[PDB]
Design an enzyme around this catalytic site. Structure first.
Site, PDB file in Angstrom:
ATOM      1  N   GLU A  49       0.848  -1.186   0.000  1.00 42.58           N
ATOM      2  CA  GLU A  49       0.000   0.000   0.000  1.00 42.58           C
ATOM      3  C   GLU A  49       0.884   1.236   0.000  1.00 42.58           C
ATOM      4  O   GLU A  49       1.843   1.310   0.773  1.00 42.58           O
ATOM      5  CB  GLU A  49      -0.885   0.046   1.254  1.00 42.58           C
ATOM      6  CG  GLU A  49      -1.904  -1.069   1.367  1.00 42.58           C
ATOM      7  CD  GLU A  49      -3.147  -0.811   0.542  1.00 42.58           C
ATOM      8  OE1 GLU A  49      -3.218   0.246  -0.119  1.00 42.58           O
ATOM      9  OE2 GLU A  49      -4.058  -1.666   0.559  1.00 42.58           O
ATOM     10  N   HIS A  86       4.601  -0.205  17.278  1.00 43.56           N
ATOM     11  CA  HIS A  86       4.967   0.419  18.550  1.00 43.56           C
ATOM     12  C   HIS A  86       3.703   0.866  19.265  1.00 43.56           C
ATOM     13  O   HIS A  86       3.149   1.927  18.968  1.00 43.56           O
ATOM     14  CB  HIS A  86       5.918   1.584  18.312  1.00 43.56           C
ATOM     15  CG  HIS A  86       7.334   1.150  18.131  1.00 43.56           C
ATOM     16  ND1 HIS A  86       8.377   1.679  18.857  1.00 43.56           N
ATOM     17  CD2 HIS A  86       7.874   0.209  17.321  1.00 43.56           C
ATOM     18  CE1 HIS A  86       9.502   1.083  18.499  1.00 43.56           C
ATOM     19  NE2 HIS A  86       9.223   0.185  17.570  1.00 43.56           N
TER      20      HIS A  86
END
Lengths: 87, 37
Positions: A49, A86
Site C-alpha cells: 500500500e 509500537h
C-alpha cells in the site's frame, strides 16, 4: 540474493528483537524484502500500500496481523522505517 | 486506500515511532546491513 538494507535505528532494534525471539517473523520480513527488490515497492506479497497523510513517500506491507513493514525505495535501495508495531 | 495509513496512525505511540524513524532515514541516522533473502 544478498540485499543491502538501510534501517532506521528503531526498526533495526525491532529486527534484532525478532532475530533473538521469533525467527519465523524474520523469515517473513525477509520474504517481503525479497519481493520489494524483485518486483518494486508496490508489487508482490504482503498487500503493498502507498501510504498517505504524513507517511507519504512510504509504503506498507503486512508482516502479520499486527506488524507492518514500512519502507521506501530510492534507486533500488530499500530503506526500512518500521518492522514492528509500537504500541 | 486510507485504512492502512489510519491503522499506523491510530496509536499515537506508533505515529511517533514512525515520525522519528522517517526523520532518521531522511537525516542520515541509519544502520545498513547485508541480508540474505
Amino acid at each position: 540474493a544478498r540485499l543491502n538494507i538501510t534501517f532506521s535505528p528503531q526498526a533495526f532494534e525491532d529486527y534484532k528483537y525478532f532475530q533473538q525471539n521469533d525467527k519465523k517473523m524474520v523469515k517473513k520480513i525477509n520474504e517481503l524484502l525479497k519481493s520489494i527488490d524483485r518486483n518494486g515497492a508496490l508489487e508482490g506479497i504482503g498487500k503493498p500500500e502507498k501510504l498517505k497523510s504524513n507517511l507519504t513517500g512510504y509504503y506498507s506491507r503486512r508482516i502479520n496481523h499486527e506488524h507492518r513493514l514500512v519502507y521506501t525505495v530510492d534507486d533500488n535501495h530499500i530503506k526500512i522505517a518500521s518492522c514492528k508495531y509500537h504500541y | 486506500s486510507m485504512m492502512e495509513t489510519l491503522y499506523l496512525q491510530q496509536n499515537p505511540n506508533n505515529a511517533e515511532h514512525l515520525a522519528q524513524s522517517i526523520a532518521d532515514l531522511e537525516r542520515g541516522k541509519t544502520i545498513t546491513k547485508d541480508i540474505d533473502v
